[PDB]
Design a protein around this ligand. Sequence first.
Ligand SMILES: Nc1ncnc2c1ncn2[C@@H]1O[C@H](COP(=O)(O)OP(=O)(O)O)[C@@H](O)[C@H]1O
Ligand SMILES: O=C(O)CN(CCN(CC(=O)O)CC(=O)O)CC(=O)O
Ligand SMILES: O=P(O)(O)OC[C@H]1O[C@](O)(CO)[C@@H](O)[C@@H]1O
Length: 451
Amino acid sequence: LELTQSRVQKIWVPVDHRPSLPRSCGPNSPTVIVMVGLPARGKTYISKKLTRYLNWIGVPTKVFNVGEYRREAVKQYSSYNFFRPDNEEAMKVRKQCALAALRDVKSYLAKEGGQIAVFDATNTTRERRHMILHFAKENDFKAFFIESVCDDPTVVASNIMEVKISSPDYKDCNSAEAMDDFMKRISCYEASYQPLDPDKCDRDLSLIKVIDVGRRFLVNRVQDHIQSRIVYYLMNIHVQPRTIYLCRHGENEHNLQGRIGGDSGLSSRGKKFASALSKFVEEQNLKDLRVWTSQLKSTIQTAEALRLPYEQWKALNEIDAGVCEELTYEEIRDTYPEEYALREQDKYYYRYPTGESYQDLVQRLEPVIMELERQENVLVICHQAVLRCLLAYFLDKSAEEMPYLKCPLHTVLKLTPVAYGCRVESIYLNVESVCTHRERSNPLMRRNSSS
Ligand SMILES: Nc1ncnc2c1ncn2[C@@H]1O[C@H](COP(=O)(O)OP(=O)(O)O)[C@@H](O)[C@H]1O
Ligand SMILES: O=C(O)CN(CCN(CC(=O)O)CC(=O)O)CC(=O)O
Ligand SMILES: O=P(O)(O)OC[C@H]1O[C@](O)(CO)[C@@H](O)[C@@H]1O
């Protein structure tokens, strides 16, 4: 009824004329994701990637890798002898690392505003899982288990070569000895390994068992929307290497005039870029390459130069500047001084009047990210703000830094899988253009001076 519209996010909220003594309160039960499985089964890979995705869509998540606690408490690894089930002391130290991590999990979800905590450890015995469940119950946390099962020696071997040998645990080993040591290490866990049994012993646990690197899944009792989204995500990512290229439309006429938004066409240089891009793509020599564009002219003209089939996504259209569309930043500053200042102070959350914020962009791009995960080689031709958002996802950049990432015209960002993340290579196609990047740029108000 009598509402007021927040200046930054433009959200209508009830006016709350605070009383003489305003009161606060202080400030959707948080969840503990329990990874399960033998070493070299992708638990850490899954932990980091899912966390990258959840934080990007706005769900504060953090990984608690018990291995890092262990490496912190023991300083330098020597051999798998540390992981022998008959190693009483180590068993004690490992359990203490687990409890220390849970201690931090508790502090994260109950005191730091965290919503999802990913507990990354083997948790291969029913007893250890029972303990974690107890910890969850007593703290009012939900528990969701993600078990990765892989009986393909080729996959295990490959996993060891990709992230284990170059691990700091093996800084003093060559590949062969590191490989040999890790296999012995894995065998240490095999005797006591009790996989999740949803059809019996674990009938009441909320879980997903990932099998054969995502070929088959067993899902038991999803409890809410967050677990729902987690399962959807897990079931649509794969590990086969591929390449994602990101770039903007070639320079357009509005760029030349310093005007934002709009649907202008390529400038003469933008067209030169489009040709260069075709030459670039050709040289990458990719068997298959999917091309995606927004539904705005400039990206489409750019794709036409490639002589390849392309698909238009309205979701890739540039951020909508609302009433500031078609204006120059100078005209925005002069015509809407307050809006200009508000955006400068909170570029990620700020929403243009009748328009969007980077936050809105992210929500809009969720489907693009999910489909990108399903794809192989793909080239996305988009716009500045959109590219920053997609780049933030791939490079795990925060919301605060997202609106300022540098994504220049006529430059391809080549992303490739490396270990637990993505490597980025910048390739400028040598065609001039303007620069659309803009960095982050009192006295009288104090005396003297659900599921
Ligand atoms: N569902 C999966 N099954 C088997 N390997 C996987 C899976 N998902 C990812 N990987 C691979 O596992 C590696 C990362 O393993 P890591 O996460 O360190 O294993 P762990 O944490 O279980 O010891 C990567 O090479 C990745 O390709
Ligand atoms: O150490 C890591 O980076 C992740 N670990 C998970 C935790 N480590 C703890 C440790 O290495 O001390 C294994 C475990 O939980 O027993 C992967 C694995 O070996 O399963
Ligand atoms: O988020 P930023 O830095 O204001 O840039 C947004 C602008 O970038 C552009 O793509 C111009 O380069 C505009 O169409 C859009 O409004």
